[PDB]
Amino acid sequence: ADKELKFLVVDDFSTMRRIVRNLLKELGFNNVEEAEDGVDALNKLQAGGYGFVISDWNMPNMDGLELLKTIRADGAMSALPVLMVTAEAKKENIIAAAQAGASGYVVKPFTAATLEEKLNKIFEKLGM
Amino acid sequence: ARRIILSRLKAGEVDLLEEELGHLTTLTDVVKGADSLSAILPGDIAEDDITAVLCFVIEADQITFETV
Ligand SMILES: [Mn+2]
């Protein structure tokens, strides 16, 4: 996967947003932008040129499931890879993620090795 | 009840997929083969939902469902 691939980290808490960014840097990814919620994310995606979205589940205005759904139904970024970050491997939440078209899900707190595993499975799965 | 069968799994995938199945339902008669995993599903979860979940890891063609 191209190391200058552009990431968008979406979370309502600035600390988690920073953690994820540092983790992506530990993995050799430095082209990263942040967003505070679903709405803010859709707005930033408009700029285009994004190759990856990592998003949290719980957020005001627009949560992660809704952001994912909007991404998928958007004919111009419809195939953009999206990794859902969740605080619990909850049965009902994992199905929703799967059916909504998520590229995968990861339970926080997560490690850098876990993230790499998650990224590679998605890259591999999409021939990246 | 019904039977699920998972094939051509790589190293680690048997445990990983057993756990993944855990989060979604209660499995009985679990059989952990070297690169395969089979089990009896209670029926409380729609099969399509399962496929969608396991596909976070494997491919659909590696998943099969059948009556016991
Ligand atoms: Mn949150």
| Cβ–Cβ under 8 Å, residues B51 and B63 | yes
Q: Which amino acid is at A8?
A: L
Chain B positions touching A105 (Cβ under 8 A) are: 56
User: Closest residue of A to B53, CA-based?
Assistant: A98
How many Cα atoms occupy the beta-carbon half-sphere of B61 within 13 Å?
1
CA distance A72 to A55: 14
User: Closest residue of A to B23, CA-based?
Assistant: A91
Residues recorded for chain B = 68
Separation of CA A95 and ligand 1 centre (Å)? 19
Which of the 8 DSSP states describes residue A75?
T
Domain extent, residue A54, equals 1-128
For A88-123, letters b (16+ CB in 10 Å) and e give: eeeeebbbbbbebebbbbbeeebeeeebeebbebbb
* d(CA A7, nearest CA chain B) in Å: 20
- Integer-rounded Cα Rg, in Å, for chain B is 11
Give the torsion sign (CA, A70, A71, A73, A74). positive
Chain B interface includes A25 (CB < 8 A): no
Q: How many domains does chain B have?
A: 1
Nearest CA among A55, A28, A118 for reference residue B57 = A118
Solving technique for this entry? X-ray
Q: Per the structure block, which two tokens stand in for A40?
A: 């803010």
Q: Which H or E element spans position A119?
A: helix A112-126
CB-closest option in A90, A99, A121 to B52: A99
| Cβ–Cβ under 8 Å, residues A33 and A6 | yes
| Cβ–Cβ under 8 Å, residues A51 and A71 | no
Tell me the sheet residues that pair with A84: A55, A105
**Chain centroid to CA A59: how far?**
13
Provide the greatest CA pair distance for chain B: 29
Nearest CA among A104, A124, A128 for reference residue A114 = A104
CATH classification of the domain holding A23: 3.40.50.2300
Which of the 8 DSSP states describes residue A20?
H
| Cβ–Cβ under 8 Å, residues A99 and B52 | yes
CA distances for B48 relative to A108, A128, B54, B55, B63, angstroms? 26, 27, 10, 11, 11
Q: Is residue B54 packed enough to be buried (19+ CB in 10 Å), middle (13-18) or exposed (0-12)?
A: buried
Domain extent, residue B32, equals 1-68
Q: What is the DSSP string of B5-66?
A: EE-S--TTHHHHHHHHHHHH---EEEEE-SS-EEEEE-S-S-HHHHHHHHTTTS-GGGEEEE
Q: What is the DSSP string of A85-109?
A: EESS--HHHHHHHHHHT-SEEEESS
Q: Which residues contact B20 (CB under 8 A, 6 or more apart)?
A: B53, B54, B56, B57
User: Closest residue of A to B52, CA-based?
Assistant: A98
Nearest CA among A15, A51, A57 for reference residue A38 = A57
